[PDB]
């Protein structure tokens, strides 16, 4: 069994366009990896933190691309280490729906460096570590090209980077790694 939450960056800068482009990959990605006993959560962050869905709201409607197409876009600036944390605290949590023995696994995509964020990754990697958190990473658009900017991919990917993050040039480009991400998520899960 397998509780998947998704943790997605709304901040204004993404476009209208690439908004949906988001919400098409996520909606397609929860689809091909729907299995038994599998469960997906949502989350969107920006400067605010929205969870769309817990894994117990999916329990009893289980249905991903009818959960994902209403939401809208928050806008603002980009705390994804605070977004971290309210995913480890609120999302991997029995009260919402997670459960005990299931494989933890979240991925994380986000369009821009951490900003205003008043959390470092040294404040909530070490905490998903504990709770066995599987942590993949989509770094999408110009904002990931740099090797100095793919340092924040990897502190917030699980160990080693190489398995755990992906880098798309745009929203366009999000499509061409929805097979890797299955097979990789397959490869933990069967």
């Given at each position: 069994?397998?509780?998947?939450?998704?943790?997605?960056?709304?901040?204004?800068?993404?476009?209208?366009?690439?908004?949906?482009?988001?919400?098409?990959?996520?909606?397609?990605?929860?689809?091909?990896?729907?299995?038994?006993?599998?469960?997906?959560?949502?989350?969107?962050?920006?400067?605010?933190?929205?969870?769309?869905?817990?894994?117990?709201?999916?329990?009893?409607?289980?249905?991903?691309?009818?959960?994902?197409?209403?939401?809208?876009?928050?806008?603002?600036?980009?705390?994804?280490?605070?977004?971290?944390?309210?995913?480890?605290?609120?999302?991997?949590?029995?009260?919402?729906?997670?459960?005990?023995?299931?494989?933890?696994?979240?991925?994380?995509?986000?369009?821009?460096?951490?900003?205003?964020?008043?959390?470092?990754?040294?404040?909530?990697?070490?905490?998903?570590?504990?709770?066995?958190?599987?942590?993949?990473?989509?770094?999408?658009?110009?904002?990931?090209?740099?090797?100095?900017?793919?340092?924040?991919?990897?502190?917030?990917?699980?160990?080693?980077?190489?398995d755990h993050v992906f880098q798309?040039?745009?929203?366009?480009?999000?499509?061409?790694?929805?097979?890797?991400?299955?097979?990789?998520?397959?490869?933990?899960?069967?």
């Amino acid at each position: 069994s397998s509780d998947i939450a998704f943790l997605i960056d709304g901040s204004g800068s993404i476009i209208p366009h690439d908004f949906r482009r988001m919400k098409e990959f996520v909606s397609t990605v929860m689809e091909q990896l729907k299995k038994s006993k599998t469960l997906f959560s949502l989350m969107q962050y920006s400067e605010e933190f929205r969870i769309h869905f817990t894994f117990k709201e999916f329990q009893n409607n289980p249905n991903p691309r009818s959960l994902v197409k209403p939401i809208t876009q928050l806008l603002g600036r980009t705390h994804t280490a605070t977004g971290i944390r309210k995913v480890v605290r609120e999302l991997f949590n029995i009260t919402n729906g997670a459960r005990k023995n299931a494989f933890k696994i979240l991925v994380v995509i986000t369009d821009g460096e951490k900003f205003g964020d008043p959390l470092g990754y040294e404040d909530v990697i070490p905490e998903a570590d504990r709770e066995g958190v599987i942590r993949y990473v989509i770094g999408v658009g110009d904002a990931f090209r740099s090797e100095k900017s793919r340092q924040e991919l990897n502190t917030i990917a699980s160990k080693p980077p190489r398995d755990h993050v992906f880098q798309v040039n745009n929203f366009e480009a999000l499509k061409t790694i929805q097979n890797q991400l299955r097979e990789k998520i397959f490869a933990i899960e069967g």
